[PDB]
Design a protein around this ligand. Structure first.
Ligand SMILES: Nc1ncc2cc(-c3c(Br)cccc3Br)c(N)nc2n1
Ligand SMILES: [Cl-]
Length: 446
């Protein structure tokens, strides 16, 4: 078991990682910006290192400072959490080069999944169903590009290979817009990622966003841990996630899960991972893979009983997976509401000092947050300050518990999305289940 790790993150996920470390007897090093001195996990950590000023570029994205903190404390590993450097292959490369364990896959694997074109090619080869597409980068020959779009059939979507999570993409519905749409996506990709490579896919009009959780060790074991429905979103930002996905049969789960686990074996995957799919008309279509542990990981934990962060740490230490596939069983239902410090009218981050705080409790209620009474939410980082996760024997009980929990949650002094989350729980279409990726924005528009 790893002696000491650097938690290379902040907020709720850093606290999540800290708890996992404490359970396994792993010493904690909390690296933090000067604005994050009073973070809950920082105050609970065995050792603390201030790695720079408030802006992320000089703290949480500061590669030399994070590695130096690992060096000075005698830490053996670095957990990147999600966001920041978690998908940075060069960082993972430098970490291993410096002699520390990167809690994640090999840098080569991160690089592969960050290249959406090569990732799709690897998945298609492995037998994972993908979106009908160009199967390769688009060139400058517009006669060829029109032929590809005709073969696929309009509408199509142009996507940046260096993009992801809905960054750098646009829908094309006819030949007249194809040239300009390709050029613009290319230009945006060059400006944002220093990679102008773009590809084409059949545009699915009303899919659900369904993703498969995987775990793979260094002993050759690779398992799938059911799916998550992440369709309740606004402008490429998840709002509510749930597990399992409504309407997904054990047969479908088995079908797509086995294909994801087989892909892990083929590519030599290691650690936690997420296969993102579009789900439409009872069919799965792979779009991208995430190599990090994700925001919405707790819903998977509730329905399987598997502590995913602890599995990450065990894998990194050289231990096999604590569970086999036949030991993985979907039981009950979990819903996650992301709690954001945001203005209800603009959806812009709303930082400030929390004057009164109270967390919900009870059977099946899980609260994941660093916030406390007197805590100031800084303006420099993401708006998400907490996660409320509710579990039940069925979906209806999970939703009922969420409604009760949201009503107990008090966060005064700052503006939050608690009222919005309550509106979503009370939404008849959500209560029926199976709403698509576009539902929330349509609801808010009406
Ligand atoms: N080929 C397609 N067809 C449809 C889609 C849809 C999404 C999507 C998703 Br999965 C979530 C929110 C918005 C959007 Br535009 C996406 N990220 N990628 C897609 N690729
Ligand atoms: Cl994430």
């Amino acid at each position: 078991m790893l002696d000491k790790i650097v938690i290379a993150n902040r907020g709720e996920i850093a606290l999540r990682i800290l708890r996992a470390c404490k359970e396994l007897g792993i010493k904690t090093v909390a690296v933090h910006s000067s604005a994050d001195r009073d973070l809950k996990h920082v105050l609970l950590a065995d050792e603390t290192v201030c790695i720079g000023p408030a802006p992320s570029v000089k703290s949480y994205l500061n590669i030399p400072a994070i590695i130096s903190a690992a060096e000075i404390t005698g830490a053996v590993a670095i957990h990147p959490g999600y966001g920041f450097l978690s998908e940075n292959a060069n960082f993972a490369e430098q970490v291993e080069r410096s002699g520390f364990i990167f809690i994640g896959p090999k840098a080569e694997t991160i690089r592969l999944m960050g290249d959406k074109v090569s990732a799709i090619a690897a998945m298609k080869k492995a037998g994972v169903p993908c979106v009908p597409g160009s199967d390769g980068p688009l060139g400058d020959d517009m006669d060829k590009n029109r032929a590809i779009a005709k073969r696929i059939g309009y509408p199509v979507i142009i996507k940046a290979s260096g993009g992801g999570g809905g960054r750098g993409m646009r829908v094309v519905r006819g030949d007249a817009e194809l040239a300009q749409s390709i050029s613009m996506t290319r230009a945006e990709a060059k400006a944002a990622f220093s990679n102008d490579m773009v590809y084409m896919e059949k545009y699915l009009e009303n899919p659900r966003h369904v993703e498969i959780q995987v775990l793979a060790d260094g002993q050759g074991n690779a398992i799938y841990l059911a799916e998550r429905d992440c369709s309740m979103q606004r402008r490429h930002q998840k709002v509510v996630e749930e597990a399992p996905a409504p309407g997904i049969t054990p047969e479908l789960r088995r079908y797509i899960g086995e294909r994801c686990a087989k892909a892990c074996v083929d590519i030599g995957y290691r650690g936690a991972g997420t296969f993102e799919f579009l789900f439409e008309n009872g069919e799965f279509y792979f779009i991208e893979m995430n190599t990090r542990i994700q925001v919405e990981h707790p819903v998977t934990e509730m329905i399987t009983g598997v502590d995913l962060i602890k599995e990450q740490l065990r894998i990194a230490a050289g231990q096999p997976l604590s569970i086999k596939q036949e030991e993985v069983h979907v039981r009950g239902h979990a819903v996650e509401c992301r709690i954001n410090a945001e203005d209800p009218n603009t959806f812009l981050p709303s930082p400030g000092k929390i004057t009164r705080f109270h967390a919900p409790g009870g059977f099946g209620v899980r609260w994941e947050s660093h916030i406390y009474a007197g805590y100031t939410v800084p303006p420099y980082y993401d708006s998400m300050i907490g996660k409320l996760i509710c579990y039940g024997e069925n979906r209806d009980v999970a939703i009922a518990r969420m409604k009760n929990a949201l009503q107990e949650l008090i966060i005064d002094g700052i503006k939050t999305n608690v009222d919005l989350q309550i509106r979503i729980m009370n939404d008849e279409n959500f209560q029926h289940g199976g709403t698509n990726i576009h539902y929330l924005e349509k609801k808010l528009g009406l």
